[PDB]
Amino acid sequence: GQPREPQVYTLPPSRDELTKNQVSLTCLVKGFYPSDIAVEWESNGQPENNYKTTPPVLDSDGSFFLYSKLTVDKSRWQQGNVFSCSVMHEALHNHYTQKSLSLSP
Amino acid sequence: KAKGQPREPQVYTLPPSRDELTKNQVSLTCLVKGFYPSDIAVEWESNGQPENNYKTTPPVLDSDGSFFLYSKLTVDKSRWQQGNVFSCSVMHEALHNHYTQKSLSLSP
Numbered sequence: 001g002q003p004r005e006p007q008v009y010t011l012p013p014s015r016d017e018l019t020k021n022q023v024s025l026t027c028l029v030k031g032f033y034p035s036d037i038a039v040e041w042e043s044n045g046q047p048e049n050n051y052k053t054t055p056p057v058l059d060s061d062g063s064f065f066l067y068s069k070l071t072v073d074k075s076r077w078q079q080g081n082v083f084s085c086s087v088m089h090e091a092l093h094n095h096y097t098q099k100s101l102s103l104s105p
Numbered sequence: 106k107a108k109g110q111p112r113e114p115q116v117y118t119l120p121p122s123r124d125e126l127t128k129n130q131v132s133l134t135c136l137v138k139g140f141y142p143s144d145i146a147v148e149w150e151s152n153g154q155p156e157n158n159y160k161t162t163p164p165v166l167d168s169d170g171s172f173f174l175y176s177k178l179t180v181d182k183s184r185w186q187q188g189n190v191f192s193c194s195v196m197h198e199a200l201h202n203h204y205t206q207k208s209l210s211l212s213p
Contacts, residue, residue: 009122011134017117026119028132028177054162054175067162067175069136099124 003091004063006032010085010101013077023074025101027085030065032056038088041070043081048072080104108170113199114140118209121185131182133209135193138173140164146196149178151189156180185211 006029013023029039035056041048050071056064068085082102088095114137121131137147143164149156161176176193190210196203 007125009125009132011119011122014117014119014136017115024117024136024138026134026136026175028122028134030132030177050168052165052167052173054165057160057162059160060158060179065160065177067134067177069138069173069175071168 004033027068112141133178
């Protein structure tokens with residue numbers, strides 16, 4: 001079992017969820033091995049409060065994946081705040097990698 | 106905010122991240138959240154027939170006492186780019202007919 005680096009992808013809220021007062025921001029972390037991993041969410045250099053992460057799940061190729069869900073007030077999403085998903089894993093070159101997510105360009 | 110009562114799942118489909126379009130296969134995501142109790146089944150289908158390459162996470166207890174999970178369907182990028190419609194089906198006791206289905210496809 002060779003170590004494999006996680007691939008990190010951020011997903012904005014579904015348009016159907018945009019009708020609610022709170023929305024979900026998703027971080028997909030896939031293709032990693034071994035399963036030991038840490039995931040955090042932040043915004044404006046401060047960690048977020050309301051997020052949960054699934055346990056790692058074995059994928060069809062023998063690597064693992066997981067999802068982390070951050071819940072925020074829709075107003076914070078629409079005001080263009082940038083949210084970031086940070087991942088720590090032994091296979092990453094610097095043991096750390098981050099991806100951002102925002103409504104703004 | 107009383108916990109412990111049956112709650113209907115909310116089912117949301119999410120397309121691949123733009124960054125994943127650099128790969129030969131992409132991930133189609135189904136977020137199922139706000140449900141209670143935790144017993145639930147999820148399946149993906151297209152062209153009516155079931156899909157092969159998908160995996161679902163176990164349910165996770167959320168901050169409000171309900172559960173959520175994600176299901177990931179992996180498809181060749183070309184199938185996604187051609188506009189094929191994929192559907193996430195969910196079975197749970199709190200849903201009308203104990204079932205709901207939500208589609209996902211590339212907007213033209």
